[PDB]
């Protein structure tokens, strides 16, 4: 009786549930008429299970919302399925213009191939197609529990969640066998992440992070990784020689460097830039990339180090003196947009190891600059030594006139000018040539080099130190010939006035740094034998 009714109720209610479940294709979204009748069917179902949360007291907890949603999750598995078994025909149809649109060569039937990524960058597109239709379509038309049923947003997590699974054995399947190129996953790890951040990422589901699709394409990144350092060293090779063959020129007067440094950092920069565009949402992962291409930019950097070094000294031949200031100047540069890199690959925040490999290498690379300016002051050392025996002589012919009205007699002035002079066709035409053309860090690490030079050579050959020699039983050391009053004067006053030479008003070394220089007190020591009769007992 009252039996008869509830059985034909369910009955009822099921016979809904079943056209619900077939919502898209019982009702096409082409016609207007008939999402009328979509709309007309959810209400009439709404008010079947209405009427049984009330007359029928019973509990009835089938809550319309929720089998409206549990048959539209359905309606959505089957459309995956007829999606994803006419991916060709659906495609090629609607999104192919174009040259060789015919169809529909490769069975077994694409979806997927091992050979090919096509499948999936079709099946992406398709899946779009029904989203936007869920939204565009059929959620203006159940707008019935807007709180609880938003058909677009179920369209998109089903959708996402079917094709994720796909996709995650996809991976693992090309992970294995890896016949696509690298370019190839690159593009499809990117069409996905677009994808997920359009659709899925804002759904409460996901909203709590974090992905697990960027770990499908891990491993193809790190080869593309891998390929690509490849490619950077094989750009650095010939990024030089079109500098070499170019000779070095400065890029601009206000620019210090050569053109092949802003090629190396540039091309650096564009597979940062590749990386940087997956925004890969998994800082595990992200890590994993940086800590890989701070050995890719290391081996790199280090490769330009390398190549100079190996060629520097060839370059140290005076006719071209400019050049070899050059080279030193790249790699200042080196130094300096390595450090602009390390802020883009995101400073402090930057995994550790990846920050330290960076460190470990601004650090080796700014040794090369000290082996570089070193071999280059030592360029010169051959035509230091001849200016300071040349300058020792001068400082042996000097003696004192004044003793008759000889008003022609030289000042302690004047003498010590003309013991400076021979190395003084040094300090006007190159440390003015230097400064011109040099980073003040390279510069000042020239200068401090030369100086040492100078002071070296110095304590070697005006000095004269005196010999060993037999003396009863053993070896010992014989006296100093001591330097005349005049002459101690001359050589103080020229030692003062090479010192300024170096401080340059401001422009060169500063006084702190000569006046502590070892260097400096390792040659007033050894004046100090020879200078024993203007030396201060207690000063």
Not at 36 to 51: A, G, H, R
Request: hydrophobic share 35%.
């Amino acid at each position: 009786g009252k039996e008869r009714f509830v059985k034909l109720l369910d009955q009822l209610h099921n016979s809904l549930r079943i056209d619900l479940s077939m919502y898209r294709n019982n009702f096409p979204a082409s016609s207007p008429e008939r999402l009328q009748d979509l709309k007309s069917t959810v209400d009439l179902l709404t008010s079947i299970t209405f009427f049984r949360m009330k007359v029928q007291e019973l509990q009835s907890p089938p809550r319309a919302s929720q089998v409206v949603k549990d048959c539209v999750k359905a309606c959505l598995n089957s459309t995956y399925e007829y999606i994803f078994n006419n991916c060709h025909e659906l495609y090629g149809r609607e999104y192919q213009t174009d040259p060789a649109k015919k169809g529909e060569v490769p069975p077994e039937e694409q979806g997927p191939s091992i050979k090919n990524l096509d499948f999936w960058s079709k099946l992406i597109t398709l899946i779009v197609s029904i989203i936007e239709e869920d939204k565009n379509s059929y959620t203006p038309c159940l707008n019935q529990f807007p709180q609880e049923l938003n058909v677009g947003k179920i369209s998109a997590e089903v959708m996402w969640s079917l094709f994720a699974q796909d996709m995650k054995y996809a991976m693992e399947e090309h992970d294995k066998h890896r016949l696509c190129k690298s370019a190839d996953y690159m593009n499809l790890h990117f069409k996905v992440k677009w994808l997920y951040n359009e659709y899925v990422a804002e759904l409460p589901t996901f909203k709590d992070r974090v992905p697990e699709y960027p770990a499908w394409f891990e491993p193809f990144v790190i080869q593309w990784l891998d390929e690509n350092e490849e490619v950077s060293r094989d750009f650095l090779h010939g990024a030089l020689e079109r500098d070499k063959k170019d000779g070095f020129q400065q890029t601009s007067e206000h620019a210090l460097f050569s053109c092949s440094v802003v090629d190396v950092f540039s091309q650096l920069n564009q597979s940062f830039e590749i990386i940087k565009k997956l925004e890969c949402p998994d800082p595990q992962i992200v890590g994993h990339y940086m800590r890989r291409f701070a050995k890719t930019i290391s081996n790199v950097l280090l490769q330009y180090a390398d190549i100079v070094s190996k060629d520097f000294a060839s370059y140290c031949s005076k006719e071209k003196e400019k050049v070899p200031c050059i080279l030193m100047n790249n790699t200042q540069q080196l130094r300096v947009q390595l450090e602009k890199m390390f802020e883009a690959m995101g400073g402090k925040e930057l995994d550790a190891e990846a920050s330290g490999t960076l460190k470990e290498l601004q650090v080796k690379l700014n040794n090369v600059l000290d082996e570089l300016s070193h071999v280059f002051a030592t360029s010169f050392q051959p035509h230091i030594e001849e200016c300071v025996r040349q300058m020792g002589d001068i400082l042996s012919q000097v003696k004192g006139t004044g003793n008759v009205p000889a008003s022609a007699c030289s000042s302690v002035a004047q003498d010590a000018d003309n013991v400076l002079q021979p190395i003084m066709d040094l300090l006007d035409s190159n440390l003015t040539l230097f400064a011109k053309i040099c980073e003040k860090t390279v510069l000042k690490r020239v200068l401090k080099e030369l100086w040492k030079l100078v002071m070296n050579t110095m304590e070697r050959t005006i000095v004269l130190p005196p010999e060993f020699s037999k003396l009863k039983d053993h070896m010992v050391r014989e006296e100093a010939k001591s330097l005349t009053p005049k002459q101690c004067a001359v050589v103080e006053l020229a030692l003062d006035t090479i010192k300024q030479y170096f401080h340059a008003g401001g422009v060169g070394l500063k006084k702190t740094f000569l006046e502590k220089s070892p260097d400096l007190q390792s040659l007033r020591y050894a004046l100090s034998l020879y200078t024993q009769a203007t030396d201060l007992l207690i000063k």
